[PDB]
Ligand binder design. Structure first.
Ligand code: NA
Lengths: 152, 151
């Protein structure tokens, strides 16, 4: 097995053993993690199933990250749930710790979006101009799509 | 009243020496901003985007550098100025001309010790001031001259 493949297995097992709750799909290159909205943000209270796919060229190429249940955020395509790959790539390196996607990358993205060049223009505009509507829109999406109730 | 303040604060900024481009409306615009004399930013040129929230001026503007800048309280990738740092200076009677005449030059002269948005910039500022200045100089030449802005 390649250095890249050895890293995939080691990385994913490391992630499985972490505090993060992992469900494996087709194999170790596709898993889903239960992710909780960060405290002190409009996402607080939300629960999401975040799917991660690892490319064959991992870890040189970054994982792709998608929210399987709906989220409203300037840098996440609403209809697909896909996190902006340019944003992931600003953080990702060949030695970046996969567990930090959940501990560090995603909490910080949700807390502090980049509303310039957004994947969700609606969310970006509200973020910048109507922060109270932005927060309320997120709270409504949480109640409709991102509670334990909604997920079952 | 707040909206009356938005319209007149923006029109005053338009009337001032500061060069303003309006984007979607009076609540979003870009101002051409020159690095303050006697700081490591001296000589740099930036396009600074300001967005005004509906409850302005009770709520502060958000402020982003549209071409790259290296500073502890500014997120390098997005150009976003730390909103907590903005809020420490913002009041309901603060206006827009002072964002450019007072707030931003004082911030570029004196980074704020609030948890940094640029950790690399904070570490250099604090422990390697000479490398901090050199890196800013390099970023200015690369991202923040009139020529770099044309491109
Ligand atoms: Na003007």
């Amino acid at each position: 097995p390649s250095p890249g493949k050895r890293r995939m297995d080691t990385d994913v097992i490391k992630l499985i053993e972490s505090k993060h709750e992992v469900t494996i799909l087709g194999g170790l290159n596709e898993f889903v993690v239960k992710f909780y909205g960060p405290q002190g943000t409009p996402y607080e209270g939300g629960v999401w199933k975040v799917r991660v796919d690892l490319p064959d060229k991992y870890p040189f190429k970054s994982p792709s990250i998608g929210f399987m249940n709906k989220i409203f955020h300037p840098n996440i395509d609403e209809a697909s749930g896909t996190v902006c790959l340019d944003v992931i790539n600003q953080t990702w390196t060949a030695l970046y710790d996969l567990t930090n996607i959940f501990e560090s990358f995603l909490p910080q993205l949700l807390a502090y979006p980049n509303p310039i060049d957004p994947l969700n223009g609606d969310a970006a505009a509200m973020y910048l101009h109507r922060p109270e509507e932005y927060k309320q829109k997120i709270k409504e999406y949480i109640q409709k799509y991102a509670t334990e109730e909604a997920l079952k």
